[PDB]
Amino acid sequence: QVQLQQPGAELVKPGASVKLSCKASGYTFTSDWIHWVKQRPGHGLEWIGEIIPSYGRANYNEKIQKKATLTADKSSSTAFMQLSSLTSEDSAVYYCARERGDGYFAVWGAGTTVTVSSAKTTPPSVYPLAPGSAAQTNSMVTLGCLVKGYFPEPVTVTWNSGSLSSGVHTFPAVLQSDLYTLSSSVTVPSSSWPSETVTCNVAHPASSTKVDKKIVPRD
Amino acid sequence: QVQLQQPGAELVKPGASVKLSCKASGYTFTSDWIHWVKQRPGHGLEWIGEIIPSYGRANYNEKIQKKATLTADKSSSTAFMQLSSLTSEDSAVYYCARERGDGYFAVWGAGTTVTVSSAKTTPPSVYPLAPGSAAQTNSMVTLGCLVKGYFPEPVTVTWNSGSLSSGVHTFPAVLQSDLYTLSSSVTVPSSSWPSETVTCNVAHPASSTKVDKKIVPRD
Amino acid sequence: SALHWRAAGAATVLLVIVLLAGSYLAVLAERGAPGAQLITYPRALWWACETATTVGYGDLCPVTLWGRLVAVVVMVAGITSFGLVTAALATWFVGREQERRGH
Amino acid sequence: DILLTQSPAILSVSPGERVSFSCRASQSIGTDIHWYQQRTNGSPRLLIKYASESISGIPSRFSGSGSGTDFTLSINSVESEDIANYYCQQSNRWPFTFGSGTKLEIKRADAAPTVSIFPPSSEQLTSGGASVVCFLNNFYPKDINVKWKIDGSERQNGVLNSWTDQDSKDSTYSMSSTLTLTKDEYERHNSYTCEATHKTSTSPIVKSF
Ligand SMILES: CCCCCCCCCO
């Protein structure tokens, strides 16, 4: 079972605040420490702070600007990190991890992509990508999806809800006028489409709008 | 209240000696250490020595030339530093500080500007600085004082005895033929002078002669 | 209030005095010696505790004659105090073992 | 003796930006380091004790970190009143030692100087001498030149200048050019001007009486 659960994304405008959550499952001892790790795009891991739910004491990184407040809740087994007065520099993916008190991080969370901007939340527009009429096909056929006009990141694109993994590419998003845009491709054998259904699943946690899209050949 | 008090300045000729004082107030424990710090013009801080008034034991810096003698007086709560046979290299500002025995210096003294020279003590000549007859004035008017013909340094220049602080500059003194010379300026709103009294207060601790000077417009 | 409980109680009080006074005398003796780390009261008090209890981690150690002389006093006062308690605990147990018999 | 190295000696930073000071010990001293502040002609003021512990009275703008040999004093969004000399001091081994110090300066916007010419006082003329004082206040950068022309003729004799460090109220600079002349030389001249060549203006800002 997924031991550590975190929200997909949180959109915050500068000056405001946000309270991330980290619901934990599995073995919950009294010696467990919940850590938080900040990772800016392209950069490495950065230890923010730690907290022990059993006692409620929390320590923080002192080398950096302290703008985090760690609280716990033993009743629901969920750790909370309070970020106050954020800027563009605070826009990153915040991981949470469980330490047994022996030094290492056994399990991590999916991470919460916190975006700092004054823009508005926009659902993604999903469009199919079927080959043209005069497009010859070999032993393999390449399909795809088009996800654009969404904000903020990220978006989770799966083919056939996970059952399709091989021959799948999901290109990084580009930013054009406060709107992210990416595309995903799938490569199935030529003798399997459109006989067998191939559909993409696009999830946008920032607006909580997950939609599907079947790839049918051009009529 | 001012916890550590030191004389303004002490003029000594080479070969002679001087005994600085550091009258302490506030909480006086038995674990208190009185330190002395030497600072030459343009240079940094330099630990001279330490002393505990409770026991009377005193330690000194061994890396430098030892020409200091630390004594105490529990009856009057005053520490004394005896400097013997001084040269031009010993001319500096000597700070005294109180340590609770925990390592750091909680409070410092104003510092005693010790000058080593064979010259004579001379009171400062204070002169007003009012704008000319054909000097146009905007939304702000600039006045000033002229302090010259004094020795040795320093001199404390205050406007209206402290109540005026904003828009006040006190330029460093220049040395011309064994006589220091500086100037101070004040910038008050145009619609406040000479309606409201603007006077400078010049103190010369080396001769203990503090004088005032009102800035009146040119007749 | 017998003797053994009186001496053990007085030893505990005396031990506290030695710990406090030892911290004061250590700093006073260690300062002036280059490289000495036992030069502040709070950690000198911590040093005294791990000295009287024999432990002696090694994080703090006197390097002067009088500083080490003070340490020896702390050691002896520590060992004697913790030893005077044990002797008191024995007299308590012995005197009660007689009560479980015919005395 | 423990050596404390503060590099760089001068730290230049834009307003409202985070600035970090460095202090390095020649050997491990745990967290027994202390930070002080000293403005122009002032006494040192304790900012941070024991590496990271804050001091009551000191603004929350200041913070400290580090352990062992490397320590750091940081100022989140520096302002004009933070212009001073920053020293570090260790208390791990005897004797206590200080750092070389670090000068903090703020790079503000270009500001035009405010020239002000002042005739000699009537009290000074009675003494048997005279002196015309010129104030070039609140300019940036500090690179500036002052010229004295008597009757249109450039004067260089009897000119004593004095510059101030970066003012801790607006991050600017100021200087005072004083032309000292005997009373006899002051009578046979009449006109005195004070020119000021600065970056902000191609034409020199002058003031005469
Ligand atoms: C056993 C303790 C002796 C007392 C030492 C006092 C400190 C001496 C200062 O040099």
Side-chain angles (χ1 to χ4, degrees), chain A residues 1-4 6-22 24-62 64 66-88 90-119 121-132 134-135 139-164 166-175 179-189 192-209 211-219, chain B residues 1-4 6-22 24-62 64 66-88 90-119 121-132 134-135 139-164 166-175 179-189 192-209 211-219, chain C residues 2-5 7-54 56-100 102, chain D residues 1-16 18-146 148-152 154-189 191-209:
Chain A
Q1 66 283 359
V2 174
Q3 309 190 221
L4 263 51
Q6 293 182 274
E10 294 285 347
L11 181 59
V12 187
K13 44 187 55 184
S17 299
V18 62
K19 194 171 186 177
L20 303 186
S21 60
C22 189
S25 65
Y27 287 112
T28 306
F29 298 98
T30 183
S31 62
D32 286 21
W33 288 80
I34 298 300
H35 300 254
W36 292 87
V37 178
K38 175 182 179 181
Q39 184 182 33
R40 296 156 64 178
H43 295 186
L45 305 177
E46 180 176 348
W47 187 81
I48 314 170
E50 61 182 348
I51 184 180
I52 170 175
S54 310
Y55 192 84
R57 183 187 177 94
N59 303 286
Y60 309 90
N61 195 18
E62 64 179 25
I64 67 183
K66 183 187 181 305
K67 51 180 57 181
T69 298
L70 299 184
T71 57
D73 188 89
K74 293 173 293 183
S75 58
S76 58
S77 297
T78 308
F80 305 98
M81 180 175 63
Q82 173 68 19
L83 300 176
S84 63
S85 299
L86 293 81
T87 63
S88 60
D90 298 321
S91 180
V93 175
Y94 297 88
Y95 293 90
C96 75
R98 174 197 294 174
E99 181 214 1
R100 295 303 190 186
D102 38 26
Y104 56 91
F105 309 105
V107 290
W108 293 69
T112 300
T113 306
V114 177
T115 303
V116 178
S117 178
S118 299
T121 303
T122 314
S125 299
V126 183
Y127 305 109
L129 289 177
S139 61
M140 233 71 62
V141 52
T142 301
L143 311 177
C145 282
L146 176 62
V147 180
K148 71 150 49 189
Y150 69 95
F151 190 91
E153 274 192 300
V155 280
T156 302
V157 177
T158 66
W159 291 91
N160 290 342
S161 300
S163 53
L164 269 184
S166 296
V168 174
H169 298 159
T170 304
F171 311 92
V174 295
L175 185 58
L179 282 179
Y180 285 94
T181 291
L182 52 73
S183 185
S184 182
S185 63
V186 60
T187 308
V188 297
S192 60
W193 183 85
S195 177
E196 303 168 4
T197 300
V198 176
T199 172
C200 66
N201 315 87
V202 180
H204 187 252
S207 60
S208 66
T209 58
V211 293
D212 295 331
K213 184 68 64 177
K214 183 180 180 180
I215 307 300
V216 292
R218 305 194 64 87
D219 193 89
Chain B
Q1 66 283 359
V2 174
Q3 309 190 221
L4 263 51
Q6 293 182 274
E10 294 285 347
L11 181 59
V12 187
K13 44 187 55 184
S17 299
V18 62
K19 194 171 186 177
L20 303 186
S21 60
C22 189
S25 65
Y27 287 112
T28 306
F29 298 98
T30 183
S31 62
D32 286 21
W33 288 80
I34 298 300
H35 300 254
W36 292 87
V37 178
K38 175 182 179 181
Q39 184 182 33
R40 296 156 64 178
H43 295 186
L45 305 177
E46 180 176 348
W47 187 81
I48 314 170
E50 61 182 348
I51 184 180
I52 170 175
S54 310
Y55 192 84
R57 183 187 177 94
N59 303 286
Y60 309 90
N61 195 18
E62 64 179 25
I64 67 183
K66 183 187 181 305
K67 51 180 57 181
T69 298
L70 299 184
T71 57
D73 188 89
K74 293 173 293 183
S75 58
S76 58
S77 297
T78 308
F80 305 98
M81 180 175 63
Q82 173 68 19
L83 300 176
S84 63
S85 299
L86 293 81
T87 63
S88 60
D90 298 321
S91 180
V93 175
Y94 297 88
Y95 293 90
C96 75
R98 174 197 294 174
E99 181 214 1
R100 295 303 190 186
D102 38 26
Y104 56 91
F105 309 105
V107 290
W108 293 69
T112 300
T113 306
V114 177
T115 303
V116 178
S117 178
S118 299
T121 303
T122 314
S125 299
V126 183
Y127 305 109
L129 289 177
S139 61
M140 233 71 62
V141 52
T142 301
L143 311 177
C145 282
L146 176 62
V147 180
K148 71 150 49 189
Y150 69 95
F151 190 91
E153 274 192 300
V155 280
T156 302
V157 177
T158 66
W159 291 91
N160 290 342
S161 300
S163 53
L164 269 184
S166 296
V168 174
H169 298 159
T170 304
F171 311 92
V174 295
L175 185 58
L179 282 179
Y180 285 94
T181 291
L182 52 73
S183 185
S184 182
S185 63
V186 60
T187 308
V188 297
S192 60
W193 183 85
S195 177
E196 303 168 4
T197 300
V198 176
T199 172
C200 66
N201 315 87
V202 180
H204 187 252
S207 60
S208 66
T209 58
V211 293
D212 295 331
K213 184 68 64 177
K214 183 180 180 180
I215 307 300
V216 292
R218 305 194 64 87
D219 193 89
Chain C
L3 178 67
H4 55 274
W5 289 119
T12 300
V13 176
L14 184 62
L15 178 61
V16 174
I17 301 180
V18 175
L19 291 181
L20 295 177
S23 313
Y24 182 85
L25 294 178
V27 176
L28 185 56
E30 289 300 313
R31 289 195 180 188
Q37 289 182 313
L38 200 58
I39 58 183
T40 52
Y41 304 108
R43 70 185 56 182
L45 182 59
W46 157 246
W47 164 81
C49 296
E50 58 168 310
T51 299
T53 55
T54 71
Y57 293 111
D59 55 331
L60 294 173
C61 181
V63 299
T64 63
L65 171 60
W66 291 102
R68 288 169 177 178
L69 217 58
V70 162
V72 172
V73 175
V74 176
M75 295 172 185
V76 175
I79 297 180
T80 300
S81 299
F82 284 103
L84 197 63
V85 172
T86 301
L89 294 167
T91 308
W92 177 29
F93 291 161
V94 165
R96 193 138 311 277
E97 184 66 12
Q98 309 303 312
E99 301 183 7
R100 272 189 60 257
Chain D
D1 297 26
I2 301 178
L3 181 62
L4 299 177
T5 296
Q6 301 189 244
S7 184
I10 301 179
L11 201 46
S12 193
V13 63
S14 298
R18 181 175 177 88
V19 53
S20 301
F21 300 89
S22 178
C23 184
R24 193 170 185 176
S26 57
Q27 49 183 150
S28 181
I29 59 182
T31 55
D32 304 321
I33 198 69
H34 311 281
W35 289 94
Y36 299 90
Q37 181 193 65
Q38 186 183 34
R39 295 187 174 95
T40 299
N41 286 330
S43 60
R45 159 167 284 271
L46 180 62
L47 298 177
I48 300 295
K49 68 178 180 181
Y50 289 100
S52 59
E53 299 183 7
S54 57
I55 302 299
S56 180
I58 302 300
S60 59
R61 200 185 312 109
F62 290 83
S63 63
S65 63
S67 59
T69 57
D70 292 86
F71 306 95
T72 300
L73 174 66
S74 293
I75 307 177
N76 196 90
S77 296
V78 58
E79 64 188 44
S80 297
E81 70 172 358
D82 293 329
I83 300 178
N85 288 321
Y86 296 87
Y87 296 86
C88 67
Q89 170 253 337
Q90 64 89 15
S91 61
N92 187 81
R93 296 178 182 270
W94 196 93
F96 296 164
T97 53
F98 291 93
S100 59
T102 301
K103 181 66 164 298
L104 179 63
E105 62 182 21
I106 273 70
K107 291 177 299 181
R108 59 157 293 164
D110 297 26
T114 307
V115 187
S116 298
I117 182 62
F118 294 92
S121 63
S122 59
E123 295 111 315
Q124 185 183 5
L125 295 174
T126 312
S127 303
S131 59
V132 278
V133 189
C134 188
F135 288 151
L136 311 186
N137 301 141
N138 305 277
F139 59 87
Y140 189 84
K142 55 183 178 181
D143 296 276
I144 202 178
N145 295 270
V146 51
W148 289 85
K149 299 180 179 179
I150 310 182
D151 289 332
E154 177 174 311
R155 182 81 179 196
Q156 297 182 5
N157 293 328
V159 177
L160 293 179
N161 298 333
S162 181
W163 305 264
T164 59
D165 280 315
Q166 195 175 17
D167 186 81
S168 60
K169 295 172 294 183
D170 61 337
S171 304
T172 59
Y173 295 86
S174 298
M175 71 167 301
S176 60
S177 183
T178 301
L179 175 60
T180 299
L181 310 159
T182 186
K183 201 241 294 183
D184 290 23
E185 191 70 21
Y186 179 74
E187 302 283 4
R188 52 201 201 101
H189 266 298
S191 182
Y192 304 91
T193 200
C194 178
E195 307 203 356
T197 302
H198 195 263
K199 175 189 175 183
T200 55
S201 181
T202 59
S203 59
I205 305 178
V206 322
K207 290 257 186 299
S208 58
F209 74 101

